[PDB]
Amino acid sequence: PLVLVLQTYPDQSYQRPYRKDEYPLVRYLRQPIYMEVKVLSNDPNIKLVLDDCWATSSEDPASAPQWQIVMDGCEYELDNYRTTFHPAGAHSGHYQRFDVKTFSSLIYFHCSALICNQVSLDSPLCSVTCPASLRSNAEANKEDTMTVSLPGPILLLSD
Numbered sequence: 001p002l003v004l005v006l007q008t009y010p011d012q013s014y015q016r017p018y019r020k021d022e023y024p025l026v027r028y029l030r031q032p033i034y035m036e037v038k039v040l041s042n043d044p045n046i047k048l049v050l051d052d053c054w055a056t057s058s059e060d061p062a063s064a065p066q067w068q069i070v071m072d073g074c075e076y077e078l079d080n081y082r083t084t085f086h087p088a089g090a091h092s093g094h095y096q097r098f099d100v101k102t103f104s105s106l107i108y109f110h111c112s113a114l115i116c117n118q119v120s121l122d123s124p125l126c127s128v129t130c131p132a133s134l135r136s137n138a139e140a141n142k143e144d145t146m147t148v149s150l151p152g153p154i155l156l157l158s159d
Contacts, residue, residue, distance in 0.1 A: 002039055004048070006111055006148035009034045012086070014097060023152025024106065028159045032084070032099040037113045037148060039094045046115050047093035049073060049125050051145045053100075053111040055081070061110040061147055069100055070111065073125050074132035105156045112145040 007017035008025060012034055018025060027033055039048050053070035056063050067079040075083040086097040096113070116126035123143045 002041065002046070002115055004113055004146045004148050005038050005040065006109070006150055007036050007038065008150060008154075009036060012099070014086075018151075020151040023150070023154075025152070025154045026157065027102075027154055028157050029102050030159065032101055033154065034086075034097070034099045035109070036095055036097045037111055038096075039115065041094060042091070044091065044093075045117060047118070047126065048096050048113060048115055049123075049128075050096055050098075051112040051114060051125055051143055053083070053109070054079075056108045056110070057106065059108055059153070061108075061149055069109075070098075072132040072135075073128040074130035076132070102156055104158070106153045107156055108149065108153045110147060110149045112143075112147050114143055114145045
């Protein structure tokens with residue numbers, strides 16, 4: 001089994017992740033929060049991709065209310081979040097880096113993600129077109145994904 005994690009980094013340099021005892025983080029509205037979904041491996045073939053990312057006001061990723069950040073591999077802006085991806089310029093496919101921007105509140109962040117082996121059996125999420133089209137009633141479906149959350153919440157403050 002391959003194992004995924006969701007982490008936050010201090011800045012766009014992605015030098016080291018925040019650890020648990022540094023949470024809760026403190027951020028301001030419209031300030032970028034630099035996040036990464038990473039595979040803990042060492043296989044060069046594999047490529048990590050996101051499915052959904054969303055925020056809750058309680059620790060439980062299943063709790064309501066929710067704000068959608070990423071949907072079907074693409075930025076979702078309708079819930080008042082902006083996401084910017086950060087491609088790497090080795091093992092580039094072992095992680096997906098992105099920053100999120102929000103438009104005093106305590107927020108918990110989660111993503112769902114999966115791995116691509118470059119095989120016919122690869123998820124549709126392995127090659128996607130963005131922006132993503134909204135789902136129909138029947139279109140709702142679950143890929144085989146792992147849910148990952150941050151070690152702690154983030155406090156959003158008004159600038």
